[PDB]
């Protein structure tokens, strides 16, 4: 199944009353932050509040990325979730303001389920006998039909090779995709026609297909700008046509959710565009993440501010606290990886690995869980014993023992 | 549309016959030495004597150097081109600095070109159907005239299509080309070198100095001595000259020593500062020692409190409303407290609020209430 | 569920003044700020009249007075308005001079009255002789649509076009550059002289007219000195739209240089700003604007909760107390009740915290 680094996330475990369970979907800890993120996912699912900002204040090494992934998995596939690395902003050819604004347009999306009839082409109905009137038959495996087409489609027909045995896909907006060499063309058992040899296209003539599709506005802007957007003519036209599409009853808007990591490592001009553009009435909700604490804002060289965030940006932002843990549940979290791994472990090796986890950090034990099972597979043991983990604790060193040597 | 700006009351310099002083000289008041120092150099501008000179302006913020920089150009009229350019337009990312500076120098220096031409128009009659003789009739509202033309002109007309009785420019649509049988016209206009450099670049952009110097100066030399082109330079004005990179200072006081260089008036506002690009330099007026030996330093005085009435009266004449005695007294007091720009700034919203409340004049209590509404930058 | 439903401080429609330009205590707009809203009404009347040019108004005060709400009220009560940030003109393909110039010249609008003669319709011939598939007329002098410009109609069209004619004269076609920003530094003589001459000829012929615009530049605490040198000529130019600067910080060192000046500005832009300072909100004003903001998402509160909300919003920031009712409405919805309580807002205050709560608890430094 190709399990990634963390695959514990399958939910967030919120009940109807609004309580937080002790162990739900491998997310043990922080019931206050559990309720604080339940409030904001209810705010996302309520579809009434846009223009908010969430900061996850905590020490480095708590696992707030798993909390954001739990938010994204509770939302699922309906709400578009696009995380942004802080190093995705520093571009060379495109300015950073436009990158942040295009991320804000990646947030906002719509869904306008529709229809589309397929035509699929007969074999040979090249009848230009009028040019306004073209008769094209169809010979599919279900049977034969005919249709009259206005001259165009035919002007797309003579552009491509229309010979004995071709496919003609005709869309609703005169979008013709054509092939060559179908059905049968083996006349005298001769050489290559150098075409595509496809069997019979089983299926009838007239289907009525319905697809629910989520469309982002940035793909719309890319498809409309080409045959840095103007904020007086282009995006206002997009806003007007989306207003017309939702007033006629075609598309349905969904709110935008973003998640930004290493926010404090951005430039101060990105900050003064960020807390100016989140003041708009159309601004999506963006969950910010600050990694380290009190440092210097990039571009100031003297201004001291907490969490690397200026005073104008630190205001009007909700703050959720994520503190450290207690060691007596660390052996539980390793167990959450064990049922993810598929190989059961013993009881004393869990104790030694929990001792190594409470020695320096939990992530060191989580990363050493994999070579323990690897040496258990090499040596032939069905479970992980204490000798393999006590050998891999001495063979592989962390940053503290590397700074000690 | 007049579009009254800040310095819209300034008409000209106002020198009477010798160029010494006047008080109500249809513009800015006071500044006798500055008016003399800018009235000496206009004879050099109009006479085309020297080239590569520089004029330095210095003083506190509020001396009105923009007014004299406009008045030195309005006295010249449309004959001498005036193109101001601050150091912010020199700063750019894609195009470099010296290219924009050379385009500014080409916007300065201009040409005057005359031309005589003969224009023929009217409807035509032909009889010719090529032995040294072409009959061409020409009918206009003044009458008819027959002409004999060369067979090469008739061959060139035979190359295209000729309608029997059309309008042919011999050098349902086009009804009645009114005019006589021949139009001999001599017209003189002006040529900017920036458009010539663009047309050399894009006939339908960093440049090498060979086309810049030689390919222009050779045809200018061949066209002056014939009696067609006349070289007339321009006057440039560079505001905030102390806010420049030191490489720009090296380029400026090299290019002022060239043989082909117009006159440029610098504007230095601030005093000692650190020159950008270098460190630990406390040169006066943001200018190094090399450029100070080339510029003409003009010192501007401070305005007296008596001449504030002469400043505000022409602004009230431009706006078109009278000022009472107590209102003028309070405006003079607040013009002695802070700079005169704050006194000029509170002329329009006072008149607008008096138009709203229904006051045909300006009250001292009215300007007192609008000064209570917002205060100056000094007590921030 | 349409695109803008609620955001930051913009819920009031228009701006609220009177014939004597005095704001009320319970009306449209915000509660309080008599001198600030009075000066905003005076400069908005100056914009509506349009007598002179070069009017730069600076607004200042403590963080939390709502300059954005005043800007949105002046925008809705206003004509092309434009509100830009301090980093939009900072680009890589364009310079810091061309982008600010395009931000200046975009707010200027042109009304164009154009009368054309159009003969349109369906064919009924070919080969030259013109008639229709008419309802009305005949007399020559299949199925396609042909329009001929000089049935017959003299159509009058009003155009509201910005100064992006400078975009279309330098360009070859009108399809490419009319959808994004465009090229690098162009011919400035083509921008100034030919445009001013042709618009002056259009004014003399009486075909088109011009109207100015408003540009709101927020967060001017950080700005390079290139823009400060550009505004010496930009405010002293022949024509320029009105500028509303918003500066939050009092004393800030200018990036690139080393100076100590108020509002991060030099002496040249110091005397060119009509400076309006504000006043922080009192008890009754905060309680009244909370009573206004309770009517946003149709959320009712108990009697003993407004005092607690105002007590939290007085010590902490005001926008935190604005967010508290939104964070408590979901808990009240999950409670299945039509009225919030004291324990609800105390639980929301225990969940979400502010800078004054996180100042003490960050003493670990691990």
């Amino acid at each position: 199944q190709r399990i990634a680094s963390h695959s514990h996330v399958k939910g967030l475990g919120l009940d109807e009353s609004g309580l937080a369970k002790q162990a739900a979907s491998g997310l043990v800890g922080q019931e206050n932050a559990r309720e604080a993120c339940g409030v904001i996912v209810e705010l996302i699912k309520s579809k009434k509040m846009a223009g908010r900002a969430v900061l996850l204040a905590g020490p480095p090494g708590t696992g707030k990325t798993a909390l954001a992934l739990a938010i994204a998995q509770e939302l699922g596939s309906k709400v578009p979730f696009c995380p942004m690395v802080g190093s995705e902003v520093y571009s060379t050819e495109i300015k950073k303001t436009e990158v942040l604004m295009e991320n804000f347009r990646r947030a906002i999306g719509l869904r306008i389920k529709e229809t589309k009839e397929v035509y699929e082409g007969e074999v040979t109905e090249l009848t230009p006998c009028e040019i306004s009137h073209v008769i094209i038959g169809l010979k599919t495996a279900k049977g034969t039909k005919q249709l009259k087409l206005d001259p165009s489609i035919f002007e797309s027909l003579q552009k491509e090779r229309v010979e004995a045995g071709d496919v003609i896909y005709i869309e609703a907006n005169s979008g013709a995709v054509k092939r060559q060499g179908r059905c049968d063309t083996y006349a005298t058992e001769f050489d290559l026609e150098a075409e595509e040899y496809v069997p019979l296209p089983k299926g009838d003539v007239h289907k009525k297909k319905e697809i629910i599709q989520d469309v982002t506005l940035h793909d719309l802007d890319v498809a409309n700008a080409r045959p840095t957007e103007i904020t007086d003519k282009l995006r206002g036209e997009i806003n007007k046509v989306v207003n017309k599409y939702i007033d006629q009853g075609i598309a349905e808007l969904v709110p935008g959710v973003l998640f930004v990591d290493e926010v404090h490592m951005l430039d101060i001009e990105c900050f003064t565009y960020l807390h100016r553009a989140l003041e708009s009435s159309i601004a999506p909700i963006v969950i910010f993440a600050s990694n380290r604490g009190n440092c210097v804002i990039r571009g100031t060289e003297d201004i001291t501010s907490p969490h690397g965030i200026p005073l104008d940006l630190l205001d009007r932002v909700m703050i959720i606290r994520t503190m450290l843990y207690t060691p007596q549940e660390m052996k539980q979290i390793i167990k959450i990886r064990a049922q993810t791994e598929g190989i059961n472990i013993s009881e004393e090796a869990l104790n030694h690995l929990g001792e190594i986890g409470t020695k320096t950090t939990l992530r060191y034990s989580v990363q050493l869980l994999t070579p323990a099972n690897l040496l258990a597979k090499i040596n032939g043991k069905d479970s992980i014993e204490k000798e393999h983990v006590e050998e891999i604790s001495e063979l592989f060193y962390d940053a503290k023992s590397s700074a000690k040597i | 549309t007049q579009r009254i700006a800040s310095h819209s009351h300034v008409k000209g310099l106002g020198l009477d016959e010798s160029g010494l002083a006047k008080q109500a000289a249809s513009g800015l008041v006071g500044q006798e030495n500055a008016r003399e120092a800018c009235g000496v150099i206009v004879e050099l501008i109009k006479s085309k004597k020297m080239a590569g000179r520089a004029v330095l302006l210095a003083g506190p913020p509020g001396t009105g150097k923009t007014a004299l920089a406009l008045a030195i150009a309005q006295e010249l009229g449309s004959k001498v081109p005036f193109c101001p350019m601050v150091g912010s337009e020199v700063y750019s990312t894609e195009i470099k600095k010296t290219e924009v500076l050379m385009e500014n120098f080409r916007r300065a220096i201009g040409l005057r070109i005359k031309e005589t031409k003969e224009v023929y128009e009217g409807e035509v009659t032909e009889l010719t159907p090529t032995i040294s003789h072409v009959i061409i009739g020409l009918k206009t509202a003044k009458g008819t005239k027959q002409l004999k033309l060369d067979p090469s002109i008739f061959e060139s007309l035979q190359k295209e299509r000729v309608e029997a009785g059309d309008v042919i420019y011999i050098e349902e649509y086009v009804p009645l080309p009114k005019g006589d049988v021949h139009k001999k016209k001599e017209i003189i206009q002006d040529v900017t070198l920036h458009d010539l450099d663009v047309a050399n670049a894009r006939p339908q952009k960093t440049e090498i100095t060979d086309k810049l110097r030689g390919e222009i100066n050779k045809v200018v030399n061949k066209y002056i001595d014939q009696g067609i082109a006349e070289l007339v330079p321009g006057v440039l004005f560079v505001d905030e000259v102390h806010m420049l990179d030191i490489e720009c200072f090296t380029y400026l006081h090299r290019a002022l020593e060239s043989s082909i260089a117009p006159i440029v008036i610098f504007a230095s506002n601030r005093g000692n500062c650190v020159i950008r690009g270098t460190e630990d330099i406390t040169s006066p007026h943001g200018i190094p020692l090399d450029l100070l030996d080339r510029v003409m330093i003009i010192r501007t005085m401070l305005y007296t409190p008596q001449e504030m009435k002469q400043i505000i009266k022409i602004r009230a004449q431009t706006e078109g409303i009278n000022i009472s005695e107590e209102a003028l007294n309070h405006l003079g007091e607040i013009g002695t407290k802070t700079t005169l720009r704050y006194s000029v700034q509170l002329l329009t919203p006072a008149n607008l609020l008096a138009k709203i409340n229904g006051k045909d004049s300006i009250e001292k209590e009215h300007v007192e209430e609008i000064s209570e509404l917002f205060y100056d930058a000094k007590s921030s | 569920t349409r695109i803008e439903r609620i955001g930051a401080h913009s819920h009031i429609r228009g701006l609220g003044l009177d014939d004597a330009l005095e704001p009320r205590q319970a009306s449209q707009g915000m509660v309080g700020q008599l001198a600030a809203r009075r000066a905003a009404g005076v400069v908005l009347e100056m914009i509506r009249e349009g007598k002179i040019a070069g009017r730069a108004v600076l607004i200042a005060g403590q963080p939390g007075t709502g300059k954005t709400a005043i800007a949105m009220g002046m925008a809705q009560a206003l004509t092309p308005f434009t509100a830009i940030a301090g980093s939009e003109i900072f680009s890589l393909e364009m310079s810091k001079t061309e982008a600010l110039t395009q931000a200046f010249r975009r707010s200027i609008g042109v009304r164009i009255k154009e009368e054309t003669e159009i003969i349109e319709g369906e064919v009924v011939e070919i080969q030259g002789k013109l008639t229709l598939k008419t309802t009305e007329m005949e007399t020559i002098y299949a199925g396609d649509v042909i329009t001929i410009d000089k049935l017959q109609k003299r159509k009058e069209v009003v155009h509201t076009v910005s100064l992006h004619e400078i975009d279309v004269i330098n360009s070859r076609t009108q399809g490419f550059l009319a959808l994004f920003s465009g090229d690098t530094g162009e011919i400035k003589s083509e921008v100034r002289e030919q445009i001013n001459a042709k618009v002056a000829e259009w004014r003399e012929e009486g075909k088109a007219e011009i109207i100015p615009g408003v540009l709101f530049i927020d967060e001017v605490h950080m700005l390079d000195i290139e823009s400060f040198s550009f505004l010496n000529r930009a405010l002293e130019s022949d024509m320029a739209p009105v500028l509303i600067m918003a500066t939050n910080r009092g004393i800030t060192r200018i990036r690139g240089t080393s100076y100590q000046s108020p509002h991060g500005i030099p002496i040249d832009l110091l005397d060119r700003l009509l400076i309006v300072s504000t006043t922080p909100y009192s008890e009754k004003d905060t309680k009244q604007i909370l009573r206004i903001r309770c009517e946003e998402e149709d959320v009712e509160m108990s009697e003993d909760a407004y005092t607690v909300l105002t007590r939290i919003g007085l010590e902490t920031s005001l926008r935190y107390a604005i967010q508290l009712i939104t964070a408590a409405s979901l808990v009240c919805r999950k409670r299945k009740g039509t009225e919030v309580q004291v324990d609800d807002i105390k639980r929301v205050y225990s969940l979400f915290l502010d800078e004054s709560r996180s100042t003490q608890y960050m003493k670990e430094y691990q």
Binding site: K233, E237 | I113, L196, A199, E215 | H159, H164, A178
Partner: peptide, 30 residues
């Protein structure tokens, strides 16, 4: 099918005395 601004947009000293000043005609003399 909307469109914002365009229906169709709008967008004598010369006389043979300046074409000789330019070398940017088809003849590249070198």
């Amino acid at each position: 099918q909307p469109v914002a601004s365009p229906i169709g947009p709008r967008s004598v000293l010369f006389p043979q005395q300046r074409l000789d000043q330019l070398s940017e005609i088809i003849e590249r003399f070198i």
